[PDB]
């Protein structure tokens, strides 16, 4: 008897070794571990009358190959070991599957339940097996019951889903290859040096967004306004109140403050109310990335990778989802009972106490009807490495928080009417009455104020106060989380790809990490400006989202993949035309960028001068400065030197402006 000898079997293709193992244990109490080409795979002789072999793909086994040089109109699937030397290790997975496929009765794609898994399984079965004998397992968690359920409900492959993923891969590859070679070729022909440059259908509009926002930030000048704070003596309290009215000119604010001193104020309304602070909804992937970035500093790409690992451990549901809902087809009770039998037992006892034993998900807005929100399966976490445990604990507490109870806050608002004036201002304080979910998803601080006890009709006096200057503020620099939110909001990429695009931008050195903020490098800056200057259509956020909408329509059967491919060729042909025209200037710009041809540098940076010895950005900085100073003068009456000092001292002031300002203060 040969343990690993089998015939007349269905071949089940899984994406990862852990998923293959999980599927084997779902199908048999004694699955057989085999090894060939140094790859572990599983034989199921036990399940019903049929036999099964479960093999991991390890990831993509196929990649796109096209023409060399520029332009590239074609993209065809080839084994990755043949076309990508960083992927020759996959050859052994390719060999195993090809060997097991010849003697197979049929094929089951059990890759992950997203578009990538549909493509991976399709390419493998189509090329190594028989596509006409192909079925799809669609599961959202690697629990025995979810796997068995999907095995029982095996369906045809979803060719519309497959075509949507193929279309996105081919269109992404075609745009990246063509634009990146067009850039490198224009430099080779103009400076005779070859440097590696990259571009992407989503990377490039993303880099342009960041560069444009960094320019705007670097040209920002805080403008002044004035606020009035008053001190109200009423009963035993001394209340510092910031008045809700703002003033452009300092004289209007002084006027306003002085007519309030020594006036009487009367409590004319008291409002005591209990406010709800709703328990959170279960994570979709973006929400998880956002929260794990804020709390632990884990990058979006790593959050997704870690969540995928936890799903492969059977600990959470599949994390590539937009949904913030848990439908009734998911047993909350089973999850809760699982967590009760784990290190989360005491947290579950607390949720039981908070709810009385009634566990109701606070359903979020976003849906994804085939892909529920991220939640724990109820299987017990054990021995989790550090970053894994942080992510699992986030997901578990978010879920447990979502089935607990809304928090309650007591609010008291006093309305105070000034004597002789049509003006009334408020004093308010909030206290936590019931913490509830705040003790479960304990990552949300609630500001509490010391109580203030006043009755309707109580009177006091405004005894003192101050006019205070308030400087306008720049839009914040991007964080990874903040950039990721912009991508989601603009519908660039998918929630599965956005985190990787951000990481690819850093790896290829167009972006860099300055603390929590992600800023351009010089190279990223130049590439963004070049793409902006010469190829605005390919970095237009609206047109990128347009393409995203067409890709989404392939999934529904509403548009043909072949039609999106044709339309993309049309777009490439338009890029080709624009490239022939501008190629020499594109190459010249790239040359200046890397110091390859000497330029007359700006007085304050390395960019090429534009006017007055200033680059285009420092020149705009000066224009903005002159106008901002005028606004400062009209509003504050400060003299020139003092306005400059106040702009120079504010960290809101862009660096281009700050260069100009420091110069003018150094002048004589
Ligand atoms: Zn400059």
Quote the crossing angle between the two packed helices 386-402 and 285-296, to the nearest 10°. 120
Chain-centroid distance of CA 648 in Å reads 34
Alpha carbon distance 657, 620 (integer Å): 9
358: Cβ contacts below 8 Å, ≥ 6 apart: none
d(CA 607, ligand 1 centre) in Å: 5
d(CA 618, ligand 1 centre) in Å: 5
Beta pairing partners, 464:
231
Indicate the helix (H) or strand (E) that contains 97.
Answer: helix 91-102
d(CA 190, ligand 1 centre) in Å: 25
d(CA 615, ligand 1 centre) in Å: 4
d(CA 30, ligand 1 centre) in Å: 70
Alpha carbon distance 545, 549 (integer Å): 6
DSSP state letter for 274: E
Q: Extract the runs of DSSP E, i.e. beta strands, from 570-620.
A: 609-611, 614-615
d(CA 613, ligand 1 centre) in Å: 9
Alpha carbon distance 39, 37 (integer Å): 6
d(CA 185, ligand 1 centre) in Å: 28
CB 441 within 8 A of CB 392: no
d(CA 621, ligand 1 centre) in Å: 9
d(CA 566, ligand 1 centre) in Å: 43
Alpha carbon distance 18, 542 (integer Å): 40
d(CA 429, ligand 1 centre) in Å: 49
d(CA 606, ligand 1 centre) in Å: 6
Check if 9-166 and 285-403 are the same fold: no
Q: Extract the runs of DSSP E, i.e. beta strands, from 248-299.
A: 264-277
d(CA 605, ligand 1 centre) in Å: 4
CB atoms within 10 A of CB 632: 21
Quote the crossing angle between the two packed helices 498-507 and 203-218, to the nearest 10°. 70
CB 374 within 8 A of CB 282: yes
CB 284 within 8 A of CB 495: yes
d(CA 187, ligand 1 centre) in Å: 23
Query: Which residue from 27, 57, 30, 28 is spatially nearest to 41, judged by alpha carbons?
Result: 57
Check whether the bond before 71 is cis (ω within 30° of 0): yes
d(CA 509, ligand 1 centre) in Å: 22
Query: Which residue from 461, 448, 437, 436 is spatially nearest to 412, judged by alpha carbons?
Result: 448
With H, G, I as helix, E, B as strand and everything else as coil, classify residue 650: coil
d(CA 614, ligand 1 centre) in Å: 5
Sheet holding 104-109, edge to edge: 32-36, 39-44, 51-56, 9-14, 104-109, 134-136, 155-156
3-state secondary structure 515-533: CCEEEECHHHHHHHHHHHH
CB atoms within 10 A of CB 158: 17
Alpha carbon distance 349, 344 (integer Å): 9
d(CA 625, ligand 1 centre) in Å: 14
Instruction: Assign residue 262 a region (left: φ > 0; alpha: ψ between -120 and 50; beta: otherwise).
Output: left
DSSP state letter for 438: G
d(CA 267, ligand 1 centre) in Å: 57
d(CA 616, ligand 1 centre) in Å: 7
d(CA 659, ligand 1 centre) in Å: 9
d(CA 361, ligand 1 centre) in Å: 55
d(CA 520, ligand 1 centre) in Å: 16
d(CA 474, ligand 1 centre) in Å: 20
DSSP state letter for 282: P
Q: What's the Rg (C-alpha) of the chain?
A: 31
Query: Which residue from 111, 139, 114 is spatially nearest to 125, judged by alpha carbons?
Result: 111
Tokens of 495: 């929630």
d(CA 152, ligand 1 centre) in Å: 66
d(CA 603, ligand 1 centre) in Å: 7
d(CA 329, ligand 1 centre) in Å: 60
3-state secondary structure 29-94: CCCEEEEECCEEEEEECCCCCCEEEEEECCCCCEEEECCCCCCCCCCEEEEHHHHCHHHHHHHHHH
d(CA 601, ligand 1 centre) in Å: 8
Residue 455 CA: distances (Å) to CA of 2, 262, 275, 303, 654? 90, 21, 21, 52, 49
Tokens of 153: 């409900």
Beta pairing partners, 234:
237, 460
Tokens of 135: 């079925």
Place of tokens 């979810």: 146
DSSP state letter for 557: T
d(CA 643, ligand 1 centre) in Å: 23
d(CA 589, ligand 1 centre) in Å: 16
Q: Extract the runs of DSSP E, i.e. beta strands, from 437-594.
A: 459-471, 511-514, 517-520
d(CA 611, ligand 1 centre) in Å: 10
CB 633 within 8 A of CB 642: no
Alpha carbon distance 116, 617 (integer Å): 43
Query: Is the domain defined by 285-403 classed in CATH 1.10.290.10?
Result: yes
- Between strands 9-14 and 51-56, the pairing is parallel
d(CA 660, ligand 1 centre) in Å: 10
With H, G, I as helix, E, B as strand and everything else as coil, classify residue 273: strand
The experimental method behind these coordinates is X-ray
Tokens of 591: 């040359």
Tokens of 121: 């399984």
DSSP state letter for 473: -
d(CA 551, ligand 1 centre) in Å: 41
Place of tokens 């309304």: 269
Query: Is the domain defined by 9-166 classed in CATH 3.40.50.300?
Result: no
Tokens of 336: 């809760």
With H, G, I as helix, E, B as strand and everything else as coil, classify residue 213: helix
CB 647 within 8 A of CB 657: yes
d(CA 136, ligand 1 centre) in Å: 58
d(CA 486, ligand 1 centre) in Å: 28
Longest C-alpha distance within the chain, in Å? 103
Alpha carbon distance 663, 666 (integer Å): 5
Alpha carbon distance 462, 451 (integer Å): 20
The separation between the first and the last C-alpha atoms of the chain, rounded to the nearest angstrom, is: 98
Alpha carbon distance 575, 582 (integer Å): 10
d(CA 599, ligand 1 centre) in Å: 12
CB 394 within 8 A of CB 268: no
Backbone torsions φ then ψ of 607, nearest 5 degrees: -70, 160
d(CA 570, ligand 1 centre) in Å: 38
Long-range contacts of 326-335 (CB under 8 A, 24+ apart): 326/282, 326/361, 326/363, 326/372, 326/373, 326/375, 326/402, 327/369, 327/372, 330/372, 330/375, 332/359, 332/361, 332/403, 333/359, 334/378, 335/375, 335/376, 335/377, 335/378, 335/399
Query: Which residue from 116, 198, 115, 203 is spatially nearest to 501, judged by alpha carbons?
Result: 203
Alpha carbon distance 44, 30 (integer Å): 8
Alpha carbon distance 224, 246 (integer Å): 11
Indicate the helix (H) or strand (E) that contains 401.
Answer: helix 386-402
d(CA 219, ligand 1 centre) in Å: 11
630: Cβ contacts below 8 Å, ≥ 6 apart: none
Alpha carbon distance 488, 407 (integer Å): 29
Which string of b and e fits 214-233 if b means at least 16 CB within 10 Å?
bbebbbbbbbbbbbbebebe
Residue 311 half-sphere exposure toward CB, CA atoms < 13 A: 25
């Amino acid at each position: 008897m040969n343990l690993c000898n089998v015939n007349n079997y269905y071949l089940i293709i899984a994406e990862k070794s852990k998923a293959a193992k999980k599927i084997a244990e779902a199908l048999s109490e004694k699955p057989i571990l085999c090894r060939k080409y140094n790859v572990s795979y599983w034989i199921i002789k036990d399940h019903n009358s049929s036999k099964y072999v479960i093999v991991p793909a390890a990831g993509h086994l196929f990649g796109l190959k096209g023409e060399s040089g520029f332009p590239v109109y074609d993209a065809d699937w080839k084994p990755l070991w043949e076309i990508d030397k960083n992927s020759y290790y996959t050859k052994r997975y390719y060999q195993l599957i090809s060997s097991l496929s010849k003697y197979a009765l049929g094929f089951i794609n059990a890759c992950d339940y997203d578009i990538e898994g549909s493509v991976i399984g399709y390419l493998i079965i189509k090329n190594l097996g028989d596509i006409k004998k192909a079925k799809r397992m669609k599961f959202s968690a690697l629990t025995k019951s979810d796997i068995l359920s999907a095995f029982r409900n095996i369906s045809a492959l979803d060719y519309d889903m497959i075509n949507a993923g193929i279309a996105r891969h081919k269109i992404d590859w075609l745009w990246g290859i063509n634009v990146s070679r067009a850039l490198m070729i224009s430099l080779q022909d103009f400076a005779k040096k070859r440097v590696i440059l990259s571009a992407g259908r989503v990377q490039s509009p993303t880099l342009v967004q960041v560069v444009n926002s960094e320019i705007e930030r670097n040209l920002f000048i805080p403008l002044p306004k004035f606020t009035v704070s008053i001190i109200v003596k009423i009963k035993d309290y001394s209340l510092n109140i910031k008045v809700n009215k703002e003033f452009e000119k300092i004289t209007e604010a002084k006027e306003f403050l002085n007519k309030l001193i020594n006036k009487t104020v009367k409590v004319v309304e008291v409002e005591n109310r209990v406010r709800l602070l709703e328990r959170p909804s279960p994570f979709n992937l973006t929400d998880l990335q956002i929260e794990a970035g804020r709390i632990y500093g884990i990058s979006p790409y790593n959050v997704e990778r870690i969540a995928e690992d936890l799903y492969l451990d059977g600990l959470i549901s599949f994390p590539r989802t937009n949904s913030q809902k848990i439908p009734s087809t998911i047993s909350i009770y089973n999850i809760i009972k699982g967590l009760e039998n784990s290190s989360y037992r005491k947290l579950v006892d607390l949720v039981r106490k908070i709810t009385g034993g009634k566990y109701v998900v606070k359903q979020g807005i976003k849906d994804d009807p085939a892909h529920p929100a991220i939640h724990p399966t109820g299987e017990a976490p054990k021995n989790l490495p550090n970053s894994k445990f942080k992510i699992y604990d986030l997901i578990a507490r978010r879920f447990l928080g979502s089935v607990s109870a809304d928090a309650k806050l007591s609010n008291t608002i006093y309305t105070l009417k000034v004597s002789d004036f049509p003006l009334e201002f408020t004093v308010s304080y909030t206290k936590i009455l019931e913490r509830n979910w705040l003790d479960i998803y304990h990552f949300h601080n609630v500001k509490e104020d010391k109580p203030i006890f006043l009755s309707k009709g109580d009177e006091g006096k405004i005894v003192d106060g101050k006019v205070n200057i308030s400087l306008s503020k720049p839009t914040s620099r991007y964080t990874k989380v903040s950039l990721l939110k912009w991508m989601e909001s603009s519908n660039l990429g998918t929630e599965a790809t956005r985190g990787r695009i951000i990481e690819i931008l850093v790896k290829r050195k167009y972006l860099t990490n300055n603390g929590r903020y992600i800023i351009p490098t010089k190279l990223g800056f130049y590439i963004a400006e070049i793409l902006n200057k010469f190829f605005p259509d390919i970095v237009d956020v609206r047109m990128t989202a347009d393409m995203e909408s067409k890709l989404e329509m392939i999934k529904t059967g509403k548009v043909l993949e072949s039609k999106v491919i044709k339309e993309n060729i049309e777009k490439l042909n338009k890029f080709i035309e624009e490239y022939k025209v501008n190629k020499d200037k594109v190459g010249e710009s790239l040359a200046k960028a890397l110091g390859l041809i000497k330029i007359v540098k700006c007085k304050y940076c390395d960019l090429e001068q534009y006017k007055d010895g200033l680059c285009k950005y420092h020149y705009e900085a000066k224009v903005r400065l002159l106008d901002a100073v005028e606004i400062w003068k009209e509003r504050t009456k400060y003299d020139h030197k003092k306005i400059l000092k106040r702009i120079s001292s504010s960290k809101s002031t862009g660096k281009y402006v700050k260069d100009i300002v420091t110069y003018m203060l150094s002048s004589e």
